[PDB]
Ligand binder design. Sequence first.
Ligand SMILES: *[C@@H]1O[C@H](CO)[C@@H](O[C@@H]2O[C@H](CO)[C@@H](O)[C@H](O)[C@H]2NC(C)=O)[C@H](O)[C@H]1NC(C)=O
Ligand SMILES: *[C@@H]1O[C@H](CO)[C@@H](O)[C@H](O)[C@H]1NC(C)=O
Lengths: 587, 578
Amino acid sequence: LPKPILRVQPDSVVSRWTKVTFFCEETIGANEYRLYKDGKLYKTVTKNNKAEFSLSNVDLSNAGQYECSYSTQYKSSGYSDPLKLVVTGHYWTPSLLAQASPVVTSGGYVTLQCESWHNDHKFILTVEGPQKLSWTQDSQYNYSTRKYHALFSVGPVTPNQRWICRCYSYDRNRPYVWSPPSESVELLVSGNLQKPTIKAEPGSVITSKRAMTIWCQGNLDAEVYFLHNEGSQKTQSTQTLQQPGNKGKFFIPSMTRQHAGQYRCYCYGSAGWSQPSDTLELVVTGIYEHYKPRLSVLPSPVVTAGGNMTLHCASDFHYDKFILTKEDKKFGNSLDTEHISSSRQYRALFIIGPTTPTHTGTFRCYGYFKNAPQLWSVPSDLQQILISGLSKKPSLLTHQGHILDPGMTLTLQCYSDINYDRFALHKVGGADIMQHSSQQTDTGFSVANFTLGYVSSSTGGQYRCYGAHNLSSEWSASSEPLDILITGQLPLTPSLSVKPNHTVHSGETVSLLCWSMDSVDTFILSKEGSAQQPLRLKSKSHDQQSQAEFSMSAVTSHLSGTYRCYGAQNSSFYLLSSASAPVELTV
Amino acid sequence: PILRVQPDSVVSRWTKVTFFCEETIGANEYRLYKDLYKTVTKNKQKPANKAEFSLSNVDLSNAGQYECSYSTQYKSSGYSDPLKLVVTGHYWTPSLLAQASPVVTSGGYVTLQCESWHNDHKFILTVEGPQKLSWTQDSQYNYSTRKYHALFSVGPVTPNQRWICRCYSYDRNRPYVWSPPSESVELLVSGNLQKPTIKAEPGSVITSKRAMTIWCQGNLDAEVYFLHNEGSQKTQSTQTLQQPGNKGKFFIPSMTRQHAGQYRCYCYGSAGWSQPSDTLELVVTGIYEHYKPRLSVLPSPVVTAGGNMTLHCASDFHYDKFILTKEDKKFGNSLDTEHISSSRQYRALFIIGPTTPTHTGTFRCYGYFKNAPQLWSVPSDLQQILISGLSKKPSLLTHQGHILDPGMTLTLQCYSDINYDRFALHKVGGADIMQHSSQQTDTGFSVANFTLGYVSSSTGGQYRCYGAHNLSSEWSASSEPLDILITGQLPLTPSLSVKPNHTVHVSLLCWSMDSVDTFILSKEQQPLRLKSKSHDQQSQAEFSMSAVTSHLSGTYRCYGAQNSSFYLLSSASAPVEL
Ligand SMILES: *[C@@H]1O[C@H](CO)[C@@H](O[C@@H]2O[C@H](CO)[C@@H](O)[C@H](O)[C@H]2NC(C)=O)[C@H](O)[C@H]1NC(C)=O
Ligand SMILES: *[C@@H]1O[C@H](CO)[C@@H](O)[C@H](O)[C@H]1NC(C)=O
């Protein structure tokens, strides 16, 4: 019979009072297995090819050499190579933990629990001060954690003394006398002096794994600043930058989940403790990366001053609440998410009161859950809001004509008699807003180049322009609407007709007509170099053909003539048909 | 003075006590202050110089803090060190007090002390819940206060259960026979759920003895909101307005010292406790009304956008710090007070970075001490700041003429081509700024009439004008300066002369024997300035024109002025008609 193999989990060197299991692996199938400890029968396991020997809570006596044997009814033969099980004792140093938090109001108590691995009857808590205060407690035994502990209630805490606690344990009459001390647990006292001002230089919202600093500047007689996280964390700083005034540095290399939450600066000085700082809430983003939210604005990203505006942030994921932020700073408050039964979206409408110039900026929305208020989602694609104002209306004129072809490039241009430092272009129905600086032309007024790429079907619409000053943050009023029309998209093609003679006199009249057998809702007259708004007429169909009369009264030589006519439908108000054969009239 | 008690400060019940107020000086009257309680008058006619305050048969109500004052008729000054008078009861009912504060972090302990005046050996602390938790402690005896007490450490506190503690006392040999309970002390748990938003409708800064409301709106699954003052106070509200959402009402009839400090809203609901609200700091003003501070601005109450500006608030009293407020809201932070050794003033300079339109408003400054950060002084006389902007320059014209004499009323008028909703007038060197509504004249531009009272010597100066829009908070640029000149202030009167002919188809001269620095020509129009060259001890000035037109025909007068006052003119000069 082949020799068996004995395994141990965990490793052969185990700490005291920890469960261990002996695994006896054998390829043959054995009716029973026998574990021999130091040459004596210790255990016997029957059935279940591998058998286990569980030794929960290993004591010092259980340490030694072990052997496993496997047996069949017909024969047993093999003894395994012995594996030495070694038990390691525990340290005598006790553990001192603020059972609630180091925060204490003046004249109050904070409960501290001191645990250790001693059979010692009594524990001691001492405070580092001119007078030495001691508390003596008996050791209680917790059967679940298998550890001896004792709770202390230090106090009453006076706001003039610095409280640093250390724990000791001993027995009354044993040679080893006292145990080594625990780690110093310092209490945070809510004094009566003036509160320090806590700030965050990068901001209160930081993406994960990035650096940030937390500084609180308080009284000039301070000595030590404490940065207490409400997630039960505490950082201590003594060396503070003296210039200018007392400023306590707290640096975090990379933000994680354990660094988010509310923070308060506690301050001890020459005149005692001080009132705690304001609750600065830190927020770590970059979690929940899969479902990025999306934000949009109604009715337009540019609204008049003092008007209704509703921002809409929704996500396919079941977020609990949505929070809006402007720039890197929090904005407004949190709103619950509403589950639309149809669109499968969790919605939240950020209704805003009468608009103010302060609302102008860059908005983002985040998603998070109630159980983790400081763990936000990935930021959403930014949505820029620009509230208009009551300044003088700039003018938006277009080189190269209104009605364009796909193969030409349009560069929009906005100017204003008032010296505006910056101009903004907006397309009605769009979301993005383009901002360009203004250059001082020789005529003395500002001019902004708004370059636009190759004209495509999307480019047609309505463009408005706004002005602003450098120091100012309030934008101007809207500029007169600008209709950009795109030709050559609709298959239908109209035909043009002229009523009278080609050579009309300086006072003659001409009613022209463009008609088409195919259905056309509106017709548009175009002039060569039509920098002017083309004339739009609805179409009245006497025959199966749609037609429209563009009457001309008291024509002049400047009006050389009218050349092409275009068709349009109600489905797309500003996407025009192809051109009609040109017709040149001469006055 | 020193206040003595016989017997000791801790007296048995129903026993007579006497207060001795010993003072080396002789005082006409004595006043005992409890927490004015009694007054004995001895106008030195009485032999003894010390007065007694007999409190026969002391009950529980007499316990508290006591102060004695001694006064001379001409002055009173001294308060004595308060001696805590403790009355000891014999009854069974115990008292339960949160030794620190009801605030608890989830999974922690809060120490509660239960004291009583009985010889009961054991105390019990019970929590009001479905599961019954009990703590049994032996009574420790304090020999100083002669009262039996026992400390309890309730916990661990779970953020899912509502913790309401009541204390009982009993005897060891018999159980189930408890004494009546103490007042229910409910712990405030710092949960992990979403934090409520705490607000104050009137504001965070309120004058004393006035009413205010504190509302915190949190989760819609809440049940009870707790408003905990960091001065160890707690208000509980259950009935909340359902529409719209859960809103907890907290009303205070009159604000006092005990209502100031930082407040936080703790919230318990169906899903457990929640993180406490933000630390809303309440401040009660109207205290220290004796020494009102004063605030001023340099260089001018109207500065250009993005410029240096320093606000100066000082007071004769030794305040620790000064705080600036805009409107009813706090602004900036606190600044230490600097004791100027010469002017006996405690100074604080509020330096402001590059100006922003948000700084436009109404500023006040308060004084307070470090030991009481929420007890501020009486508000100072307001100082209004109006930051200018980059809008189009308005125009400033004056009906009824520029140069006026006293006993006349001047109505200033400011217009601008841009539709401005509101106009503001400023006088260079002044502090106040006048704001008027705008009138839309038929010409298409806005116009504001700025009425000025009876013209006096002080009223002369330099007035500027600014424009604004309703929705906007950014003001316009400055309007061209307007110099107002006052006639009839200097006794000397100059004379004018014309050389050629009465009927011109010419350099004029205004002369004065007395020393005169500058001369001012006036048209019966922007006045003309002439410097004086002193030939033969007389001052004179020639005004050349190099050309003449029909419009220039008129009556021209000259006034005198000195460098000491640029806008205080002399009396009128005899007319000369061209
Ligand atoms: C704004 O755009 C125009 C063109 O889009 C710039 O230049 C003018 O271009 C037209 C024809 O394209 C010429 O007839 C003009 O003579 C050009 N003007 C000048 C001054 O060269 C114009 O310069 C742009 N503005 C700025 C500040 O770059
Ligand atoms: C066309 O115009 C010419 C002159 O321009 C005129 O003589 C002629 O009669 C006109 N004919 C018609 C048909 O209108």
